[PDB]
Swiss-Prot record:
Phosphorylated on a Ser/Thr residue in the cytoplasmic domain. Changing residue 142 to M: In a breast tumor. This is TGF-beta receptor type-2. Changing residue 281 to Q: In esophageal cancer. It comes from Homo sapiens (Human). The chain holds residues 240 to 543 of 567 of the full protein. It is a single-pass type I membrane protein. Its EC number is 2.7.11.30. Transmembrane serine/threonine kinase forming with the TGF-beta type I serine/threonine kinase receptor, TGFBR1, the non-promiscuous receptor for the TGF-beta cytokines TGFB1, TGFB2 and TGFB3. Transduces the TGFB1, TGFB2 and TGFB3 signal from the cell surface to the cytoplasm and thus regulates a plethora of physiological and pathological processes including cell cycle arrest in epithelial and hematopoietic cells, control of mesenchymal cell proliferation and differentiation, wound healing, extracellular matrix production, immunosuppression and carcinogenesis.
Length: 298
């Protein structure tokens, strides 16, 4: 029943798993390996990937989930399509992108998030909305055609009506501190409305769009890649230092006025600025962003 897989190289290592480029006797595949201790993370992702309504070009393509015995115990594997260009953060660190690349990455990112958020399939049927909860450039893969696809669903939440407010309350602050929405950092979320979790994803998406813009040659002069708040906080920032910047100081990544000379960049910057608003209700939806990116004909 186990697939003929040979592990080749370690390509990624997060808080829950190790990812390997491997061969399936498509030949090249990615293998996300979790130890037994991280079973809950593997099962959360496997449940998200197993849903028939998740399938989308801007969502990582899932092949299968397996259980594999080892000498020191057992491992839990998720086998997906391999994207040679790797995660978006590593891609933006090496490359300066063109305006065409920014339009492609930006719209494919918005389309993937809008699909996760949607309470219905493209064919009109009801579907469970999913909030990623850990949107960041390292959880986005760059496809060969220079479009995006979302990966890493280990912290994701299926917006089930049976969810208890007390069961959501702790949990607690989930995600990566650097990309947490101000209301997440303030512990000020209304643990009732379904849109409130979708709004936190939109703020994180806005930081990602800023990262893409910061490396686009259409701005003119391009600086070395830096993650959001790179010059304000340490490498692995705590929630308190992030609250001090994003909330107390109302801080956001810098948009120099010279970027706004290009009409496309100006529209992108106006869009993401609305998406990172302090007030979650003032933010655009991922569907609005995808629509604004489709309007970028001229
Ligand atoms: N299909 C894939 N193709 C290529 N690289 C991949 C693939 N899936 C994941 N990676 C890489 O492996 C890294 C870790 O994978 P990920 O699915 O984010 O694991 P994680 O432990 O849950 N990370 P995190 O929760 O963000 O700390 C990613 O950041 C990518 O660099
Ligand atoms: Mg990750
Ligand atoms: Mg993860």
């Amino acid at each position: 029943e186990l697939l003929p897989i040979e592990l080749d190289t370690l390509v990624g290592k997060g808080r829950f798993a190790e990812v390997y480029k491997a061969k399936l006797k498509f030949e090249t595949v990615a293998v996300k390996i979790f130890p037994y201790e991280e079973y809950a993370s593997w099962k959360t992702e496997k449940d998200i990937f197993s849903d028939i309504n998740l399938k989308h070009e801007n969502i990582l393509q899932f092949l299968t989930a397996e259980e594999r015995k080892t000498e020191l115990g057992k491992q839990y594997w998720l086998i997906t399509a391999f994207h040679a260009k790797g995660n978006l953060q590593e891609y933006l660190t090496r490359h300066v992108i063109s305006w065409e690349d920014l339009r492609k990455l930006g719209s494919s990112l918005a389309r993937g998030i809008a699909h996760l958020h949607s309470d219905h399939t493209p064919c009109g049927r009801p579907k469970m909305p999913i909030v990623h909860r850990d949107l960041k450039s390292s959880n986005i893969l760059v496809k060969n055609d220079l479009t995006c696809c979302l990966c890493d669903f280990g912290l994701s939440l299926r917006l089930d009506p049976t969810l208890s407010v007390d069961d959501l309350a702790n949990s607690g602050q989930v995600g990566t501190a650097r990309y947490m929405a101000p209301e997440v950092l303030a512990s000020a979320m209304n643990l009732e409305n379904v849109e409130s979790f979708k709004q936190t994803d939109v703020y994180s998406m806005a930081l990602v769009l800023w990262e893409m813009t910061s490396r686009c040659n259409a701005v003119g002069e391009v600086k070395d890649y830096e993650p959001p708040f790179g010059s304000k906080v340490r490498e692995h920032p705590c929630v308190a230092s992030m609250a001090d910047n994003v909330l107390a100081d109302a801080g956001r990544p810098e948009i120099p006025s010279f970027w706004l000379n290009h009409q496309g960049i100006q529209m992108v910057c106006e869009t993401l600025t609305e998406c990172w608003d302090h007030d979650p209700e003032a933010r655009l939806t991922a569907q609005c962003v995808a629509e604004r990116f489709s309007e970028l004909e001229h």
